[PDB]
Write a sequence for this structure.
């Protein structure tokens, strides 16, 4: 029942059984994976799509078998809709055929195509239940209901909207929208509940801030709050915006960059990694008060386990790859494993194992991956031969609530 790994590189695409076996998986024939430029699992990990730039294949991971071959589909990017109804595909716009193509997974027919010139945020945003699908079109948000893409159900027009995120979980869905503002005016993030956009008291919340080059909005799993990172790795501010209408600048008690901000899956805590090296890391509660301080370290990244019971404070990029593994139930350091030269980190959905990889193009030497236990043991590793590259390693995803949050003993 352990999550699979997909390994995509010059030696081709293959799958590996998860811990503790790490045997090559018969779910995926290596033969089918040459020159693989893109691959993705569905959110529930039951479907898998891959393309070589000439074609796209869809297989069932669970009910092993090819579902579709799209023999002329030159997809560069792929994403399934959250309940597996749709495979969204993107290729560069040329001339021009609509380049964003949504395929019905059951029938392999084309549900809808759109012009999507920018690769950034190319994919439509489904609600977790797929009852809602939104696109940022001409700086407005267009909403589609029930995968009916022939009629726009609702439009959100608010000056120019540059980005939006839908709240996760069940209905009613909320949306956070980022409005940069007119020249010389402050930016803001506003929260709405779909479809209540009209009237002077429609907005759940508003937080204004001085224009930034880059804004990231992060919902909590309970859809009660958004963290907003307003950024130019230097010069960021962190804003908290709650669906109850409370908003605040988060007070980070050390000058310098904000490297990372992540929610606990509990939705009542978040972690910020901040300040000129050595970076501070702090857990905050919904009052944006410090809950626990990790002091300082060689960190620029934070990763909660899916269950939110373990926190890794890691230093990747230009740092030496130290991963401080914290028990964040007991607030105890478990381990400080070192994943030198890592370009990629991901928790296993089991909340026990960790994938680190070194991939081209971010790094051209020492390509390979390691599977860790969070206690710092190396359970599995693979190094590519000198004449080979690794491009991607990823876990088979699983929906929350399938793997238990195993006690740290």
């Amino acid at each position: 029942s352990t999550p699979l790994l997909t390994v995509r590189g010059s030696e081709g695409l293959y799958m590996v059984n998860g811990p503790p076996h790490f045997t090559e998986s018969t779910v995926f024939p290596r033969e089918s994976g040459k020159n693989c430029k893109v691959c993705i699992f569905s959110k529930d990990g039951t479907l898998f799509a891959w393309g070589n730039g000439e074609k796209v294949n869809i297989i069932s991971v669970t009910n092993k078998g090819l579902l579709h071959s799209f023999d002329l589909l030159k997809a560069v990017c792929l994403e399934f809709s959250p309940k597996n109804t749709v495979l969204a595909t993107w290729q560069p716009y040329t001339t021009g055929i609509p380049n964003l193509q949504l395929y019905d997974v059951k029938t392999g027919t084309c549900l809808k195509s759109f012009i999507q010139k920018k690769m950034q945020n190319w994919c439509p945003s489904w609600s977790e239940d797929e009852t809602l699908c939104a696109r940022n079109v001409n700086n407005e948000v267009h909403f589609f209901e029930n995968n009916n893409f022939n009629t726009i159900a609702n439009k959100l027009h608010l000056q120019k909207i540059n980005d939006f995120v839908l709240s996760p979980g069940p209905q009613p869905y909320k949306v956070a929208v980022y409005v940069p503002g007119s020249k010389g005016a402050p930016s803001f993030v506003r929260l709405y509940q779909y479809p209540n956009f009209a009237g002077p008291h429609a907005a759940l919340a508003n937080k204004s801030f001085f224009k930034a080059d880059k804004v990231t909005m992060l919902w909590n799993k309970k859809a009660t709050a958004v963290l907003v990172i307003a950024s130019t790795y230097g010069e960021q501010t962190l804003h908290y915006i709650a669906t109850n209408g409370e908003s605040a600048v988060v007070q980070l008690p050390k000058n310098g960059p904000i490297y990372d901000v992540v929610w606990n899956s509990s939705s009542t805590e978040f972690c910020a990694v901040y300040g000129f090296m050595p970076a501070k890391a702090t857990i905050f509660n919904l009052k944006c008060d410090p809950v626990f301080d990790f002091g300082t370290g060689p960190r620029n990244a934070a990763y909660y386990s899916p269950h939110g019971h373990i926190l890794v404070l890691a230093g990747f990029g230009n740092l030496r790859g130290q991963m401080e593994v914290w028990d964040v139930k007991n607030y105890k350091l478990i381990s400080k494993p070192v994943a030198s030269d890592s370009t990629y980190f991901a928790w296993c959905p089991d909340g026990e194992h960790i994938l680190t990889a070194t991939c081209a193009p971010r790094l051209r030497v020492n390509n390979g991956y390691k599977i860790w236990h969070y206690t710092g043991s190396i359970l599995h590793k693979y190094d590519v031969p000198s004449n080979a590259e690794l491009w991607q390693v990823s876990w088979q995803p699983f929906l929350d609530g399938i793997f238990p949050a195993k006690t740290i003993t």
Remarks:
- The radius of gyration is 22 Å.
- The chain is about 0% helix and 45% strand.
- The first strand starts at residue 5 and ends at 9.
